[PDB]
Amino acid sequence: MSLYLFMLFLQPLSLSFVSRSFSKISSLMMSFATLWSAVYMWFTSNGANQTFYQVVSWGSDWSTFGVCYTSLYISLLCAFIFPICVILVQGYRALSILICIQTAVSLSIVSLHMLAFYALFESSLLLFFILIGRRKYGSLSAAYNISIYTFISALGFLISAFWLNWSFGSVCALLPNEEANSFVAFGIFILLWVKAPLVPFHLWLPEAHVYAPTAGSVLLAGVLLKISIVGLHVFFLPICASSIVKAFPLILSICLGSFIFSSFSTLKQIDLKKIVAYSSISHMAIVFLSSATNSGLGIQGAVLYCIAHGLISPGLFLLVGILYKNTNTKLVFYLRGLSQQAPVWWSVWVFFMLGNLAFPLFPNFIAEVVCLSALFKNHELYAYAFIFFSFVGTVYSSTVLGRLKGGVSSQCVDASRLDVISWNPLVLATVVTGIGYM
Amino acid sequence: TFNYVIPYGGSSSYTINNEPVKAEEVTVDFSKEPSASSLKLADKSDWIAYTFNNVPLMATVGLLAGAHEAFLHYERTPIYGKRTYNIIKKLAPIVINKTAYATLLGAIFCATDALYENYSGKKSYTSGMVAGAATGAVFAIGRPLPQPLVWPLVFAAAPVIADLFGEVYPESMKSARGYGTPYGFENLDDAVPTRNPIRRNPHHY
Amino acid sequence: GWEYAGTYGALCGMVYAIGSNVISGRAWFRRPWVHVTSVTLSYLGSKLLDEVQDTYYLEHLKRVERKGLQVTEEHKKLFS
Amino acid sequence: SGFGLQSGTARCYDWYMDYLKCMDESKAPMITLRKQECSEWLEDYNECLHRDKLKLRKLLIEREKNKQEAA
Amino acid sequence: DEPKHQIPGNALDNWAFLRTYAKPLPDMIHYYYYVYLFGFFFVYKVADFPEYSPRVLVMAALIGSLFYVRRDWVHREFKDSP
Amino acid sequence: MWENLWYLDILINVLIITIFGLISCSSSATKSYDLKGCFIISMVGGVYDIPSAILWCLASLSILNFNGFFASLFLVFTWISNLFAMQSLNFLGIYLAFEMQSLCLLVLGKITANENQRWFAYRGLLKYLVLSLIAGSIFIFHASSSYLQSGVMISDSLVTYVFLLFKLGVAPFHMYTLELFSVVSRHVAFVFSTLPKLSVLYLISNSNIGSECVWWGLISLWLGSISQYQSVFVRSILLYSSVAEIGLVLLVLQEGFSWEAFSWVSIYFLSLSGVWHANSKFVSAISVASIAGLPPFLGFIGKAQILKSLVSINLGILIFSSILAATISFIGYLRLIRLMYLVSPVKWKNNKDSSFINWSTWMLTVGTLPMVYSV
Amino acid sequence: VDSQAEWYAEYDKLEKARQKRRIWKWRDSDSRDEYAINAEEPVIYIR
Ligand SMILES: CCCCCCCCCCCCCCCCCC(=O)OC[C@H](COP(=O)([O-])OCC(O)COP(=O)([O-])OC[C@@H](COC(=O)CCCCCCCCCCCCCCCCC)OC(=O)CCCCCCCCCCCCCCCCC)OC(=O)CCCCCCCCCCCCCCCCC
Ligand SMILES: CCCCCCCCCCCCCCCCCC(=O)OC[C@H](COP(=O)([O-])OCC(O)COP(=O)([O-])OC[C@@H](COC(=O)CCCCCCCCCCCCCCCCC)OC(=O)CCCCCCCCCCCCCCCCC)OC(=O)CCCCCCCCCCCCCCCCC
Numbered sequence A: 001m002s003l004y005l006f007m008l009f010l011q012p013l014s015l016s017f018v019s020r021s022f023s024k025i026s027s028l029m030m031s032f033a034t035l036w037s038a039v040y041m042w043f044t045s046n047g048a049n050q051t052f053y054q055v056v057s058w059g060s061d062w063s064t065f066g067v068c069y070t071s072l073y074i075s076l077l078c079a080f081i082f083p084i085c086v087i088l089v090q091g092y093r094a095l096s097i098l099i100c101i102q103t104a105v106s107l108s109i110v111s112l113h114m115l116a117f118y119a120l121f122e123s124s125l126l127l128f129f130i131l132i133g134r135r136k137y138g139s140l141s142a143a144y145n146i147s148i149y150t151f152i153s154a155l156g157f158l159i160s161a162f163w164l165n166w167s168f169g170s171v172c173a174l175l176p177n178e179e180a181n182s183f184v185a186f187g188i189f190i191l192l193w194v195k196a197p198l199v200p201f202h203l204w205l206p207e208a209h210v211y212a213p214t215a216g217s218v219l220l221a222g223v224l225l226k227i228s229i230v231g232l233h234v235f236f237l238p239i240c241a242s243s244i245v246k247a248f249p250l251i252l253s254i255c256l257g258s259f260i261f262s263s264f265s266t267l268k269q270i271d272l273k274k275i276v277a278y279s280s281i282s283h284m285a286i287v288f289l290s291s292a293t294n295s296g297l298g299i300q301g302a303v304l305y306c307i308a309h310g311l312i313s314p315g316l317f318l319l320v321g322i323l324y325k326n327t328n329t330k331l332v333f334y335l336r337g338l339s340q341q342a343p344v345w346w347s348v349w350v351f352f353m354l355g356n357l358a359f360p361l362f363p364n365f366i367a368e369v370v371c372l373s374a375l376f377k378n379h380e381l382y383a384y385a386f387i388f389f390s391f392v393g394t395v396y397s398s399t400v401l402g403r404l405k406g407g408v409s410s411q412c413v414d415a416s417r418l419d420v421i422s423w424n425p426l427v428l429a430t431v432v433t434g435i436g437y438m
Numbered sequence B: 001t002f003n004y005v006i007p008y009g010g011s012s013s014y015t016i017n018n019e020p021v022k023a024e025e026v027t028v029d030f031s032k033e034p035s036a037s038s039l040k041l042a043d044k045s046d047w048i049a050y051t052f053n054n055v056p057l058m059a060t061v062g063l064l065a066g067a068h069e070a071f072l073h074y075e076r077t078p079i080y081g082k083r084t085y086n087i088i089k090k091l092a093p094i095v096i097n098k099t100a101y102a103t104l105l106g107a108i109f110c111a112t113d114a115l116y117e118n119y120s121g122k123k124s125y126t127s128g129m130v131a132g133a134a135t136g137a138v139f140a141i142g143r144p145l146p147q148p149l150v151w152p153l154v155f156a157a158a159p160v161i162a163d164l165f166g167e168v169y170p171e172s173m174k175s176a177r178g179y180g181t182p183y184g185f186e187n188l189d190d191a192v193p194t195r196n197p198i199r200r201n202p203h204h205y
Numbered sequence C: 001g002w003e004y005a006g007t008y009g010a011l012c013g014m015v016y017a018i019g020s021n022v023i024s025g026r027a028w029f030r031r032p033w034v035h036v037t038s039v040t041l042s043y044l045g046s047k048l049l050d051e052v053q054d055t056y057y058l059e060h061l062k063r064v065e066r067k068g069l070q071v072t073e074e075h076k077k078l079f080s
Numbered sequence D: 001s002g003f004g005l006q007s008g009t010a011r012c013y014d015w016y017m018d019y020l021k022c023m024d025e026s027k028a029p030m031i032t033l034r035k036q037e038c039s040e041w042l043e044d045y046n047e048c049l050h051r052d053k054l055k056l057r058k059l060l061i062e063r064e065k066n067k068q069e070a071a
Numbered sequence E: 001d002e003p004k005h006q007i008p009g010n011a012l013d014n015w016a017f018l019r020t021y022a023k024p025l026p027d028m029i030h031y032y033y034y035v036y037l038f039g040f041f042f043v044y045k046v047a048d049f050p051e052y053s054p055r056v057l058v059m060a061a062l063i064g065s066l067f068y069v070r071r072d073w074v075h076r077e078f079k080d081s082p
Numbered sequence F: 001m002w003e004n005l006w007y008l009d010i011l012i013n014v015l016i017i018t019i020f021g022l023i024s025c026s027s028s029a030t031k032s033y034d035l036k037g038c039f040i041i042s043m044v045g046g047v048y049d050i051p052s053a054i055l056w057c058l059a060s061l062s063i064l065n066f067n068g069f070f071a072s073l074f075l076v077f078t079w080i081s082n083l084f085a086m087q088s089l090n091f092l093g094i095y096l097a098f099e100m101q102s103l104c105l106l107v108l109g110k111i112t113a114n115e116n117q118r119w120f121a122y123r124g125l126l127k128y129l130v131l132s133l134i135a136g137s138i139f140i141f142h143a144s145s146s147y148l149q150s151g152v153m154i155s156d157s158l159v160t161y162v163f164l165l166f167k168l169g170v171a172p173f174h175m176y177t178l179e180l181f182s183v184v185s186r187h188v189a190f191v192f193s194t195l196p197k198l199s200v201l202y203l204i205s206n207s208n209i210g211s212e213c214v215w216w217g218l219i220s221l222w223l224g225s226i227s228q229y230q231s232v233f234v235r236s237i238l239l240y241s242s243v244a245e246i247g248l249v250l251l252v253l254q255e256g257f258s259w260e261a262f263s264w265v266s267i268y269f270l271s272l273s274g275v276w277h278a279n280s281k282f283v284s285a286i287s288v289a290s291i292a293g294l295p296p297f298l299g300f301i302g303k304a305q306i307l308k309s310l311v312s313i314n315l316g317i318l319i320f321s322s323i324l325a326a327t328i329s330f331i332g333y334l335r336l337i338r339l340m341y342l343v344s345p346v347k348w349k350n351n352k353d354s355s356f357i358n359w360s361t362w363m364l365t366v367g368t369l370p371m372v373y374s375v
Numbered sequence G: 001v002d003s004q005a006e007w008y009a010e011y012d013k014l015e016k017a018r019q020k021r022r023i024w025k026w027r028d029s030d031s032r033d034e035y036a037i038n039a040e041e042p043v044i045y046i047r
């Protein structure tokens, strides 16, 4: 734990002292070293310690950091996917922004204090406002959308944290507190409602993904959407269970509506990144609802399905970024004959699209089975509703694949050696998790 | 819980109850109780009396809005040039119409609220929503298409916000103290006060 | 109070020196004397802030005990 | 101030000082309660300041005298 | 050439509409003086107002917001006429 | 006589520094650093508590960035007026102190304007003067009525509450700040939008000047946020932010949370220092982030104090309004970031006089973790 | 690596911090005018 935190603090530190020509190499080495430190944290985490594997405090309640089942999975996932982001991004400015964002996000996951969680997570507010609103390829509207949505939801969460700190005297997770108030429960809930894109607060995610860089999109999809489940398991369910059980019909209404309308909105997309971004929104609802059941199956299934999403959607975003570099287009209608023109890119694209459709040899299958089993434990109709409307995803995925597959094209647009190096780890991890090493 | 095997949170026994224990030995209150005037104005028994007591607020607001607009007009008219028309003949309709229409909207709101509460016999969210819906309907009699929908919704939403954050919110968090021991948890060993803190005196302005 | 105040102060003195160099367009290693001065003064200031906080903590404890808050010996141990 | 514009003190300084002394004696935890306990001294001070009760008594005497004279 | 948003209206008609904002501008002290005076007296009178229900207060605020006219609106539309 | 000596020493100090500067007036030292240090030393003799030490700290940090003996002398006059506002026990002390401060504001505004800037700066000073005359005349008239009715001058009254509302710049009394501070020097706007507030907050807390009405702080919050979002000019954005925040701080202070407002005013001074004394884009960016309340910097702590005090009093309307108005103000702050790094190439004056600006940015970044105990 | 001792030490630290905060939240008015609420405080007025 201490080694992981030290390395997380070391990565932004190194950029200040590097030569500004060695920045990429030093950043890549630092990212791999942080991954190794995360593996060490996993090694030193004994399953005998059932509640929390590790807890460290550095002199205050705010400096209390700890790893649990959800935290450990999410932290390993972010440390796994960061190096790919590092290689995809060029320039000292971009490297600095992405390193600071990753440091803040990775410190948020292991934090055990709601106020420190808020402080670390929202520190990356301007960095995305600048990142998504970059000079030539960015849009100011999307940056405004994401920044305002995050600010309002996080401020509601902050108000609830202040009320808890006033009443209980503490806001740390390790101190058992329960509240039945609905205002505080909604204050904590609204952040989850916005951060995990859930209709009708999902509008920020699409505009952000399309106008963010490929490394930015990879991080956003990979771990920033998963921060919702760390907040839910760590800071909402322990204290706000009475409210989630009181509002369960409403929770199901909103979750299933998000699933259905996000699936239907995906059908109206002509941009590849928008297609992947809307697939993410439909995928988040099952996670949110499975956790909300507050059962052993639901929590495990949600964290598993988060890992599956954080291995599948970064791959699709990376492949789309590679294709956009090769073609300078993201419109499906311009892109044809990709099967003949890019056999190696097409194979991986089809593999990852099959993963997104939750086919058996992929982690999404196991994760979906567990989540659907939890929903079936609550009620049969709950699982039946989700299982049927999964067919909408097949329609748009198949239409996109058919449009890209064949036609007449005069351009060889296939990936280079650097690109294949970029996705090889994701493919290997996807296979390893798919065979059951979840 | 922070584990994937058993449900998060906890449960409290419904059979077992905990005897209330006082937050402090001697209680000193700096919060004054509602005045008799507040109870008089809040009384909705007689809908006419309730309406006539609460309209002066609406008439006042309409008068300020009309005065603002009338002064914006007056400021513009040139003193150096003698004007053939009479300025007050121009300006009085502004203030009078603004005040009258504001008073009419507030009258509909208060009357419908009191009438619904009397007929229903219960204090509920629905009385405010229906009074607001009627007031917003009166607002959008001859207005174009989105406005027949939006104004009933906004005027109905306003009493919901007033009820939610003016009545439900204070009553939900009366017990929470912030000093001594947490309201639910008195078994824990925290410093117990002889007297509650008085951060300010009862106000008198 | 805080047991990590001095280390934090030294690191923050480094923050001052390096940031001041970067804002002015200079490299982080430029003006070496500023680094030592910033580190030493920031360490001393962080320490002093900690004792000030502790002293007013103790003054508040005395006041509340006078007022009637029945603080125990362990609670009196919480305030150094 | 209460210094008196000629010498000594103000014309109602001692009444106010009586009220202040009574507020000092009380043990109530808030100023408002303490003023509630010492209200009668404040009524003496207001009586010395404006003499409203004496004015009302003179008004009643004058009114009854006029009623008697008219009859 | 790039796809661009269609701008409703004619160029000269829109410019003529915009030119109706170019009118003699009063100085803001005249409004501020009256607002300060009546606001001071208003704050003195408010302490004597009866206590109103929160619902009525919110409805009064909504009505005031709807009835408030922006100073620019009067500027564009002002006519020195009966 | 010994108790009088403590006050008399401050006079004698100021007078001898004044006459020394008058005698030692030369072109060789137009920037009189020595008299600035002498003034800073002299103001240490007026520190008796923590709030007075905060007053001294802000006064010195202000006097560093004034140029010339004359402006520094009038900043010392402002410090004396503020020190007596804190110690005022009745109507006369409040009046004497605050209109002395108003005179110092008029003089400082007049002497920091160029010939080409006189037409607008003198207009704004005159408008400020007339509005201040309205406020003072109403205050003293109602004070005369109260002194007649009660026989005593008591600073716990509605009259001083409304006068201090004018001084704070809340709800219907914030326009003089908008008109005056738009046309005056940036340092003058900075020092007179932060330093005066501390004395008023201390006077309110110590003399029990609190009202049950929450309309004025609510109006300040909503009006400030909406006008900040609708204002095209950058100076108006920064000026309206103060209106919103001081309305919220007024709501907190009425309920007796003196400690949190005394921390907020200092964190706000440090946060506003960098955006007002704009020399570097990065410093201004950190300052704007701090004013927004953004987590990595000390501004988050200061706003957190006020918001944490709000949830304690448990007034729902205030909390709901706070959230929405905070979002609206955040849009304007984002406009400020956009203007610097995301609109057009930006070139600014190379005014390399960052006396305490680098220290203030360092304090905003660093100070969050030491002060975390407060919230 | 005695996980039990680490767990209990960390919990004790957090519980002590909570107790200290709730003591720190017990605040009467510090106003100079407020002699009733603070009657027992030792003060001197120079006025
Ligand atoms: C954290 C949580 C928060 C909680 C609370 C936080 C607390 C808040 C408050 C905290 C605030 C912290 C942040 C602010 C930091 C302050 C800003 C700052 O850093 O300085 C600004 C300021 C900015 O300088 P600048 O950017 O150049 O601009 C000024 C212009 O020059 C303008 O020119 P000028 O005309 O104005 O010139 C005046 C001035 C400015 O002039 C200069 O600054 C020019 C440079 C000065 C000469 C170079 C210094 C020589 C020693 C430096 C050692 C560097 C070592 C690195 C290389 C190793 C070499 C072997 O000259 C001076 O330096 C006056 C000081 C006199 C000392 C001069 C040196 C004496 C000889 C050495 C004494 C001992 C030697 C032992 C060993 C020596 C070898 C190691 O820096 C200084 O003025 C330096 C003053 C001191 C010089 C260093 C002396 C250190 C003693 C040697 C080290 C021995 C160990 C130290 C411990 C023992 C001490 C004896
Ligand atoms: C003892 C032995 C020694 C061992 C070492 C131990 C020492 C301990 C640490 C000491 C290391 C030195 C610290 C670095 C100082 C200078 C940093 C800097 O200038 O930033 C950019 C600078 C590189 O920029 P540059 O290319 O050289 O050009 C800069 C030009 O001046 C202007 O360029 P521009 O005009 O083109 O501006 C474009 C701007 C685009 O515009 C913006 O985006 C502005 C946005 C506003 C700020 C960003 C808001 C979000 C920041 C989140 C904080 C990041 C950490 C996240 C973790 C969560 C923490 C809760 O993009 C950027 O500047 C970079 C974007 C990412 C950097 C933002 C992070 C900077 C935070 C504030 C820096 C500290 C300044 C202190 C001032 C000192 C006195 C003057 O540094 C970096 O390479 C990356 C930033 C490294 C962050 C570490 C700083 C610590 C801040 C964390 C706060 C935690 C409390 C502090 C505790 C620290 C440990 C005690």
Ligand SMILES: CCCCCCCCCCCCCCCCCC(=O)OC[C@H](COP(=O)([O-])OCC(O)COP(=O)([O-])OC[C@@H](COC(=O)CCCCCCCCCCCCCCCCC)OC(=O)CCCCCCCCCCCCCCCCC)OC(=O)CCCCCCCCCCCCCCCCC
Residues within 6 Å of the ligand: B061, B064, B065, B067, B068, B071, B150, B154, E034, E035, E038, E039, E042, E057, E058, E060, E061, E062, E064, E065, E066, E068, E069, E070, E071, E072, F171, F172, F175, F178, F215, F218, F219, F222, F223, F226, F227, F230, F317
């Ligand atoms: C003879 C002298 C003439 C004056 C006569 C009166 C003299 C004063 C006597 C006493 C004064 C004290 C009380 C007056 C109100 C205090 C305001 C004040 O004095 O500030 C100085 C102000 C001038 O200051 P300034 O800095 O030069 O102007 C800043 C603006 O940028 C100005 O620039 P602008 O006009 O170009 O821009 C206006 C901007 C400025 O923004 C504001 O006006 C902010 C106002 C927001 C509400 C204020 C807080 C409300 C809290 C009230 C507390 C009491 C109730 C408690 C419970 C309520 C819970 C909320 O707002 C707008 O853009 C227009 C919309 C106006 C309301 C916006 C909110 C709309 C919400 C409705 C939603 C429905 C739409 C749904 C459909 C949408 C479809 C997508 O002087 C006045 O405006 C006084 C005029 C008096 C007319 C007010 C009429 C009603 C008053 C009571 C109702 C309260 C609502 C407030 C309505 C708007 C008031 C501004």
Ligand SMILES: CCCCCCCCCCCCCCCCCC(=O)OC[C@H](COP(=O)([O-])OCC(O)COP(=O)([O-])OC[C@@H](COC(=O)CCCCCCCCCCCCCCCCC)OC(=O)CCCCCCCCCCCCCCCCC)OC(=O)CCCCCCCCCCCCCCCCC
Residues within 6 Å of the ligand: C049, C051, C052, C053, C055, C056, C057, F041, F042, F044, F045, F047, F048, F049, F050, F051, F053, F054, F056, F057, F258, F259, F260, F262, F263, F264, F266, F267, F367, F370, F371, G030
């Ligand atoms: C070194 C030991 C220091 C430790 C203790 C300090 C006490 C001994 C003072 C010794 C001097 C060290 C200075 C440190 C503090 C200064 C305080 C002070 O001096 O007076 C207080 C002290 C007694 O007052 P007290 O201890 O506060 O207790 C009184 C009551 O409790 C009423 O006072 P209260 O207000 O404190 O009441 C308790 C309060 C509890 O209040 C507290 O808990 C205090 C919390 C500590 C805040 C510390 C920051 C304050 C900033 C001021 C910086 C100090 C400047 C130094 C100025 C004086 C320089 C000597 O509870 C409340 O609710 C009231 C609210 C308090 C305000 C809220 C606190 C927020 C502060 C702002 C923080 C915002 C963050 C900013 C950025 C920070 C980021 C890291 O008075 C004296 O001992 C005598 C003063 C004599 C000063 C100068 C006279 C000697 C020279 C005369 C000739 C001068 C000309 C010749 C020049 C020679 C050189 C060339």
Ligand SMILES: CCCCCCCCCCCCCCCCCC(=O)O[C@@H](COC(=O)CCCCCCCCCCCCCCC)COP(=O)(O)OCC[N+](C)(C)C
Residues within 6 Å of the ligand: A435, A436, A437
């Ligand atoms: C560009 C790529 C070119 C290279 C292509 C590579 C070709 C890959 C070859 C395909 C491999 C197929 C093997 C599938 C079996 C999975 C292997 C496996 O999981 O190892 C098992 C050992 O089991 C085996 O070895 C299986 C024997 C494989 C050979 C059996 C006959 C091969 C026919 C294939 C039919 C497999 C259908 C299985 C469907 C799930 C691990 O044992 P445990 O210690 O119990 O691990 C715990 C279980 N869990 C993983 C879930 C955590």
Ligand SMILES: CCCCCCCCCCCCCCCCCC(=O)O[C@@H](COC(=O)CCCCCCCCCCCCCCC)COP(=O)(O)OCC[N+](C)(C)C
Residues within 6 Å of the ligand: C045, C048, C049, F032, F033, F034, F036, F037, F038, F040, F041, F044, F057, F063, F064, F065, F352, F353, F354, F355, F356, F359
């Ligand atoms: C516990 C601490 C945390 C709480 C914070 C509050 C407490 C503050 C404690 C630390 C205060 C440090 C203040 C740092 C101020 C920065 C120093 C400074 O401003 O120096 C100026 C001083 O400027 C002047 O005007 C000089 C005149 C005054 C000189 C200093 C006077 C000293 C008076 C004696 C003070 C001693 C204290 C008295 C007894 C307490 C020089 O800068 P310039 O030359 O103007 O421009 C800089 C240009 N550039 C950086 C870009 C290269």
Ligand SMILES: CCCCCCCCCCCCCCCCCCCC(=O)O[C@H](COC(=O)CCCCCCCCCCCCCC)COP(=O)(O)OCCN
Residues within 6 Å of the ligand: A156, A159, A160, A163, A181, A182, A183, A184, A185, A186, A187, A188, A189, A243, A244, A247, A250, A251, A254, B164, B168, F311, F319
């Ligand atoms: C209309 C459909 C509902 C939309 C929500 C969809 C699902 C969200 C569920 C989230 C799960 C936990 C949230 C707790 C309750 C939130 C809303 C539940 C539905 C609701 O409004 O019930 C109300 C009670 O809650 C309340 O009284 C408070 C409602 C929330 C307040 C809104 C804003 C609060 C912001 C506070 C910020 C943090 C403050 C912390 C101090 C009234 O129902 P009832 O019980 O009165 O029955 C009367 C019927 N006849």
Ligand SMILES: CCCCCCCCCCCCCCCCCCCC(=O)O[C@H](COC(=O)CCCCCCCCCCCCCC)COP(=O)(O)OCCN
Residues within 6 Å of the ligand: B120, B122, B124, B125, B126, B127, B153, B154, B156, B157, B160, B164
């Ligand atoms: C910020 C909340 C504002 C509401 C936003 C809704 C969308 C705005 C559209 C305007 C429509 C007018 C507002 C109606 C909302 C109330 C919900 C209707 C539910 C309902 O009718 O039940 C009532 C209670 O719910 C209630 O009246 C209390 C429920 C509180 C509303 C839901 C709070 C959480 C919603 C937050 C969603 C996300 C925030 C983004 C806006 C009746 O109850 P009864 O007691 O009268 O029984 C009847 C005995 N006669």
